[PDB]
Amino acid sequence: MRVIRVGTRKSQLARIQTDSVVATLKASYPGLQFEIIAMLFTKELEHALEKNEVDLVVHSLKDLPTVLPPGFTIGAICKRENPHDAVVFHPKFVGKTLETLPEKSVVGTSSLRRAAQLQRKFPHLEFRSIRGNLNTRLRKLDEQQEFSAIILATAGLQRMGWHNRVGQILHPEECMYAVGQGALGVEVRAKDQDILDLVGVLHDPETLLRCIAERAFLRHLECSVPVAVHTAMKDGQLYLTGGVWSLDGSDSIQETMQATIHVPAQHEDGPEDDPQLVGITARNIPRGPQLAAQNLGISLANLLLSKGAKNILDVARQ
Ligand SMILES: Cc1[nH]c(Cc2[nH]cc(CCC(=O)O)c2CC(=O)O)c(CCC(=O)O)c1CC(=O)O
Numbered sequence: 001m002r003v004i005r006v007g008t009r010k011s012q013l014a015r016i017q018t019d020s021v022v023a024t025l026k027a028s029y030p031g032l033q034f035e036i037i038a039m040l041f042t043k044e045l046e047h048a049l050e051k052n053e054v055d056l057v058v059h060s061l062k063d064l065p066t067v068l069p070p071g072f073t074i075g076a077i078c079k080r081e082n083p084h085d086a087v088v089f090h091p092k093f094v095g096k097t098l099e100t101l102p103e104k105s106v107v108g109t110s111s112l113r114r115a116a117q118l119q120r121k122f123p124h125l126e127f128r129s130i131r132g133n134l135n136t137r138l139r140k141l142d143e144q145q146e147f148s149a150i151i152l153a154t155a156g157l158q159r160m161g162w163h164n165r166v167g168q169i170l171h172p173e174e175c176m177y178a179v180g181q182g183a184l185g186v187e188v189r190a191k192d193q194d195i196l197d198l199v200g201v202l203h204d205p206e207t208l209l210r211c212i213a214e215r216a217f218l219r220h221l222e223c224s225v226p227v228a229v230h231t232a233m234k235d236g237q238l239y240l241t242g243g244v245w246s247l248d249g250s251d252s253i254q255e256t257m258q259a260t261i262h263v264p265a266q267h268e269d270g271p272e273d274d275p276q277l278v279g280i281t282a283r284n285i286p287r288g289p290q291l292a293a294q295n296l297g298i299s300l301a302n303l304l305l306s307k308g309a310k311n312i313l314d315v316a317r318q
Contacts, residue, residue: 007054061180066219076186076202083182087168105148116226120249155182176228216297
């Protein structure tokens with residue numbers, strides 16, 4: 001353990017996210033040296049991991065599939081930023097809400113999950129795909145008049161320093177978030193235990209359990225489907241709400257389940273070589289609550305499946 005090599009894409013958001021993690025690692029490990037190597041695109045980064053070119057990579061958790069290639073694992077789930085979706089309005093609709101927009105106002109989003117939920121809740125608005133990164137989308141919004149508004153993650157605006165552009169934050173009842181949204185995942189080599197121990201300091205127990213539940217739900221249903229969730233840990237209880245929608249949002253199934261899961265306060269010297277749970281390795285967090293969280297997500301998926309979720313999903317791909 002001497003120089004820690006952190007790989008990163010050249011994009012601005014990826015670069016910011018990577019920096020926030022490196023900052024947190026330096027703070028914990030002031031005596032070590034960290035170096036940033038700037039290069040699904042996920043498979044080029046993984047290749048650099050595979051080749052020992054870098055030791056770790058930072059991702060937005062929702063961009064990581066519930067099943068990772070053998071030889072890689074999520075070594076860290078960092079404290080969640082705000083998970084909710086948000087609305088940025090055209091320069092003409094300040095103070096306005098989705099509720100208050102004019103009929104047939106056009107809302108830009110390329111997300112099936114967002115479009116399906118928002119068409120259902122706002123049948124008088126028009127939802128249309130929009131392309132580009134966050135910067136490009138904001139320019140199109142202000143520089144033309146195709147869009148009366150766009151939908152983006154609260155968390156991404158926040159990290160870009162554009163929170164003041166947020167006109168509306170959506171509640172679960174209007175729009176539930178994507179699995180893992182607002183959380184960062186650090187990906188490493190599954191068998192590299194030094195690195196795993198090192199990044200293990202980043203795990204936020206609460207976010208870790210929430211994301212295990214959410215990703216177990218997602219995986220058991222079997223980025224590119226109209227599925228959404230909401231999680232909360234409150235008073236020793238983990239709450240999981242999940243939903244599935246048809247492309248137009250007309251068909252819908254949503255349910256909530258709950259389980260007693262303590263949020264673990266203390267770390268522990270845990271079993272090396274226990275299997276990762278939904279791609280995640282957290283040997284320093286108690287196993288029990290992790291299993292309980294995964295079981296909760298499995299439970300909810302089965303309930304939705306018994307209610308027809310599979311045929312909704314077969315019709316709602318991308
Ligand atoms: C799986 C995934 N990854 C990203 C793209 C991406 N990946 C991470 C950030 C920010 C939030 C965080 O990092 O979770 C976002 C950008 C957006 O959600 O505002 C999107 C949104 C696509 C857009 O509407 O065209 C989705 C789909 C889901 O959200 O329904």
